[PDB]
Amino acid sequence: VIDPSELTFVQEIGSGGLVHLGYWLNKDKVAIKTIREGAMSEEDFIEEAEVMMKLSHPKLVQLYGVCLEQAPICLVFEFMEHGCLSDYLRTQRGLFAAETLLGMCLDVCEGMAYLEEASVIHRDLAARNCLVGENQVIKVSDFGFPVKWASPEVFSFSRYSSKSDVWSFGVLMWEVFSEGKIPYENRSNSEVVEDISTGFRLYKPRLASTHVYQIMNHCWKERPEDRPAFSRLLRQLAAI
Ligand SMILES: CN(C)CC[C@@H](c1ccccc1)n1cc(NC(=O)c2n[nH]c3c2CCC(C)(C)C3)cn1
């Protein structure tokens, strides 16, 4: 529990919740997330915190604490210098070597393999939900309808698992290797459901080798039983 007097709100850096750049004990930068008017409840925030406060891994954005004596309450996170991965890919497009893109996927895979070990389902993995830090390190952002990133059992039946996160991770790999292109030419959710149900899959980005592309396709097997766990993907990505 963080006392409100320990935080300084500097400026807005995000909204959709609201996020501010702040300082913690007037020295260190933090990202302070507050609930948006009434978009979501405080109990939801509390549930996120109860999950995230038990977790710590270098490729997961860290939740430092909760400020209970704010109205509404706020969550205090690790500040990620360069913002969201989706914007970063798009903004720096044409400057990335394949090896760099691979390293970004490995970062995320490491975060996700930790979540998998910890029995936590992300449920909304996407480049827009990854952040870029110092030295271009990628970290997975917070957790606790996006059809374009959803496995067929998720879009059809809300059947979430680590294996549905695997499907999402395959799409994220496609985003990374495509330098922030929007999956499925930004087709509608109805059309994407129809695409994936019939067996359509995303085509190979230029910067993805044949080998990388087969790992992506493995992530997009129709049955979750047929997709690799994150522990197995991590060994595959690390061996490249
Ligand atoms: C140039 N532009 C692309 C990046 C600008 C950058 C920034 C912002 C203010 C002061 C210095 C640098 N910036 C850095 C962020 N970081 C975050 O939004 C962030 N850092 N940690 C978290 C978040 C957003 C999501 C979170 C769950 C609150 C955790 C946003 N903008």
Swiss-Prot record:
Subcellular location: Cytoplasm; Nucleus
Mod. after translation: Ubiquitinated.
Residues binding ATP, per UniProt: 13-19, 33
Superkingdom: Eukaryota
Positions of post-translational Phosphoserine modification: 190
Signal sequence residues: none
Tissues in which the protein is found: T-cell lines and natural killer cell lines.
Segments forming domain Protein kinase: 7-240
Residues forming the catalytic site: 124
Induction of synthesis: Through a myriad of surface receptors including the TCR/CD3 signaling complex, coreceptors, or chemokine receptors.
Written domain comment of the UniProt record: The N-terminal PH domain allows ITK to be recruited to the plasma membrane by an activated PI3 kinase. This domain also contains a proline-rich region (PRR). The adjoining domain is a SH3 domain, which binds to PRR (from itself or from other proteins). Next, a SH2 domain is required for binding tyrosine-phosphorylated substrates. In the C-terminal region, the kinase domain is required for tyrosine phosphorylation.
Implicated disorder: Lymphoproliferative syndrome 1: A rare immunodeficiency characterized by extreme susceptibility to infection with Epstein-Barr virus (EBV). Inadequate immune response to EBV can have a fatal outcome. Clinical features include splenomegaly, lymphadenopathy, anemia, thrombocytopenia, pancytopenia, recurrent infections. There is an increased risk for lymphoma.
Function (record text): Tyrosine kinase that plays an essential role in regulation of the adaptive immune response. Regulates the development, function and differentiation of conventional T-cells and nonconventional NKT-cells. When antigen presenting cells (APC) activate T-cell receptor (TCR), a series of phosphorylation lead to the recruitment of ITK to the cell membrane, in the vicinity of the stimulated TCR receptor, where it is phosphorylated by LCK. Phosphorylation leads to ITK autophosphorylation and full activation.
Family in the record: Belongs to the protein kinase superfamily. Tyr protein kinase family. TEC subfamily.
Assembly, per entry: Homooligomerizes; this association negatively regulates kinase activity. Interacts with PPIA/CYPA; this interaction regulates TCR signal strength via a proline-directed conformational switch in ITK. Interacts with THEMIS. Interacts with FASLG. Interacts with VAV1; this interaction is important for VAV1 localization and TCR-induced actin polarization. Interacts with TBX21.
Stated name of the protein: Tyrosine-protein kinase ITK/TSK
The organism of origin for this protein: Homo sapiens
Classification of source organism: Eukaryota, Metazoa, Chordata, Craniata, Vertebrata
Gene name tied to this protein: ITK
Full-sequence range covered: 357 to 615 of 620
